[PDB]
Write an enzyme that holds these catalytic residues in place. Structure first.
Site, PDB file in Angstrom:
ATOM      1  N   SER A  49       9.198  97.712  95.771  1.00  0.00           N
ATOM      2  CA  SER A  49       7.793  97.399  95.657  1.00  0.00           C
ATOM      3  C   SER A  49       7.355  96.838  94.317  1.00  0.00           C
ATOM      4  CB  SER A  49       6.928  98.615  96.036  1.00  0.00           C
ATOM      5  OG  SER A  49       6.835  98.739  97.469  1.00  0.00           O
ATOM      6  N   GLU A  56      11.794  96.323 105.913  1.00  0.00           N
ATOM      7  CA  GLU A  56      13.161  95.855 105.685  1.00  0.00           C
ATOM      8  C   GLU A  56      13.487  95.444 104.311  1.00  0.00           C
ATOM      9  OE1 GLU A  56      11.040  94.677 108.091  1.00  0.00           O
ATOM     10  OE2 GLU A  56      11.954  95.334 110.003  1.00  0.00           O
TER      11      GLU A  56
END
Length: 257
Positions: free
Chosen positions: A38, A134
């Site tokens: 992230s 994913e």
């Protein structure tokens, strides 16, 4: 000291830090690839900002349960009302809301579009390919959804501190990152209290645990830092303390603490 942390935490570390005041660097495996996880959300908002006026962030995005993925702390509460792009950026950056990242990425043209826009700002390393969930699944040796500590620092600097954005947009990005809620045990835990930190965390398979940041000492120019890590086993746990301790080594090496 970095090798000792690798030994204590049975992990591989990737470090790059740049003191923007002096141009001094700290580096340890700075060009080794890791899943970015992230941390990509920071560069994604950078691209969103670049392509929209600030007022254009007021566009409301309607979405459904089918847009929600694995971790939706903010977006799950607003399916009925939608969220504006501004609100989605806040959610993505400050809570690491995965659905918010996927919705922003679709607004900017998807992973390939993001990749093209990163190439335009001079990043030939970062490789966006997939959406959440994913993108957090990367096997050793794979280059999809990976970057390096050097490239993440260079790109974060370019958006937040240099001329890839105009000042008002830089300020939005920085304020969102300064008020991140997910990073208190990572780079922030290696920086004295009171110094402002803008950061974005990530985690991925193989025990990957990352944080990228801008650190402002009480006066003087900021340091831009990436601390990336990964491990040998697919289902490995991470330990946030590795990242905090690596940060303290960078702060010593730069004579800041």
């Amino acid at each position: 000291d970095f090798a000792k942390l690798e030994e204590q935490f049975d992990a591989k570390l990737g470090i790059f830090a740049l003191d923007t005041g002096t141009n001094r660097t700290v580096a340890y495996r700075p060009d080794e690839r890791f899943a970015f996880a992230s941390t990509i959300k920071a560069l994604t908002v950078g691209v969103l900002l670049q392509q929209k006026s600030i007022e254009d962030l007021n566009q409301r995005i309607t979405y459904t349960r089918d847009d929600l993925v694995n971790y939706n702390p903010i977006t799950e509460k607003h399916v009925d009302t939608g969220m504006t792009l501004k609100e989605l950026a806040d959610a993505s950056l400050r809570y690491s809301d995965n659905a918010a990242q996927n919705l922003i990425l679709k607004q900017i043209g998807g992973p390939e579009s993001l990749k093209k826009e990163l190439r335009k700002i001079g990043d030939e390393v970062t490789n966006p390919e997939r959406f959440h969930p994913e993108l957090n699944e990367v096997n050793p040796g794979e280059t999809q959804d990976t970057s390096t500590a050097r490239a993440l620092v260079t790109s974060l600097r370019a958006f937040a501190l240099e001329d890839k954005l105009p000042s008002e947009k830089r300020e939005l990005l920085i304020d969102w990152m300064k008020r991140n809620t997910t990073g208190d045990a990572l780079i922030r835990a290696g920086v004295p209290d009171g110094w402002e930190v803008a950061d974005k965390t990530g985690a991925a398979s193989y025990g990957t645990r990352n944080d990228i940041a801008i650190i402002w000492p009480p006066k003087g120019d900021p340091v831009v830092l990436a601390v990336l890590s990964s491990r040998d086993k697919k289902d490995a746990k991470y330990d946030d303390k590795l990242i905090a301790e690596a940060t303290k080594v960078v702060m010593k090496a730069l004579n800041m603490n």
